[PDB]
């Protein structure tokens, strides 16, 4: 009646780019699976993102320190795009500590055993003074979807410390999803197509785990359909 799609070669043309293939897919199912996986990947992917940042020198987002050529708002904006993976802990607090002239990048963050920076060249700021020193506490936590700092700030009621700065956390690891259904020719069964999913991700989530999580979410959703409450 049906043949079963199986995870076949998952190539990495780039660190952030992954092409995952599903060969044994029935014709008429390629578009269904492709669209479903695209939706799930863009919507419900768990990921690690920065939520709150504590900078020693400043009291709010709209100030600046000495020896930095980027506004504190610009540092927060750059940190928004920071790509990081945490394994054991759901919430971690990284410490960034650097003085001296130079481009303060992501690799300068004090790395723990459970925290991996997959984009070490991601510039955070620039120090243009010899004695200028940056010390920051960057809180990175797990989440899915898009949770801006205007919804949990109503669930925190004006967070008590004034030295901490909340940033909108885009937990989505994947930035681009495409799927192509093409005629997969194989000896058994004349009518089969394969689904080639081309994915651009910030490197935080592996494509294999990505597809597995999307399938898990879809199956959990379909569980309600399987057994109907009457």
């Amino acid at each position: 009646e049906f043949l079963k799609p199986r995870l076949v070669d998952i190539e990495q043309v780039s660190s952030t780019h992954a092409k995952v293939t599903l060969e044994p897919l029935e014709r008429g199912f390629g578009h269904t699976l492709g669209n479903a996986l695209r939706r799930i990947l863009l919507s419900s992917m768990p990921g690690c993102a920065v939520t709150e940042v504590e900078i020693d020198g400043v009291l709010h987002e709209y100030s600046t320190k000495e020896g930095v050529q980027e506004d504190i708002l610009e540092i927060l904006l750059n940190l928004k795009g920071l790509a990081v993976r945490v394994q054991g802990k759901d919430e971690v607090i990284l410490t960034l500590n650097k003085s001296g002239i130079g481009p303060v990048t992501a690799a300068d963050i004090t790395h723990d055993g459970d925290v991996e920076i997959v984009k070490p060249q991601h510039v955070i700021c620039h120090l243009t003074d010899e004695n200028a020193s940056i010390s920051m506490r960057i809180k990175v936590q797990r989440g899915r979807g898009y949770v801006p700092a205007s919804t949990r700030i109503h669930s925190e009621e004006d967070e008590r410390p004034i030295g901490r700065l909340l940033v909108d956390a885009c937990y989505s690891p994947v930035e681009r999803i495409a799927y192509n259904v093409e005629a997969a020719r194989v000896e058994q069964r004349t009518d089969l197509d394969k689904l080639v999913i081309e994915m651009e991700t910030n490197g935080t989530i592996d494509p294999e785990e990505a597809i597995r999580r999307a399938a898990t979410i879809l199956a959990e959703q379909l569980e309600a359909f399987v057994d109907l409450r009457d």
Partner: peptide
């Protein structure tokens, strides 16, 4: 996701 997307994605 709801946005129409090109072939590249």
């Amino acid at each position: 996701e709801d946005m129409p997307y090109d072939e590249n994605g």
